[PDB]
Structure 1
């Protein structure tokens, strides 16, 4: 670190023997999946004998 070399954006100090290509890339992927099932069964039998 003799030369106190810095990345051009001024963010980080780097050793004299390396160089940085700035590729400031971000990837986002959000996947949401909702499954809802509802089954309602209702029965009613009624028998009357007189």
Structure 2
């Protein structure tokens, strides 16, 4: 770290045997969904006789 370097956008101190070339970003979100619902019903009889 003799002639102690620093990255161009100075926010680090690289050692003087390395050089940097700055770039990036990347991300990706994704999601899914699934629902359901069911029902039913009834029946009836009746007879009143005589």
Using structure 1 for the length normalisation, give the TM-score: 0.57
Structure 2 unpaired stretches of 5+ = none
Instruction: Report the structure number with the largest CA radius of gyration.
Output: 2
Structure 1 unpaired stretches of 5+ = none
> What CA RMSD, in Å, does the superposition of the two structures yield over aligned residues?
2.6
Using structure 2 for the length normalisation, give the TM-score: 0.57
The structure with the largest strand share of the pair is 2
Count of aligned pairs between the two proteins: 50
Judged with a 3 Å threshold, the aligned counterparts in structure 2 of structure 1 residues 47 and 20 are, in CA distance, closer, same or farther, namely farther
Between the aligned partners of 2:3 and 2:41, the Cα distance in structure 1 is: 79
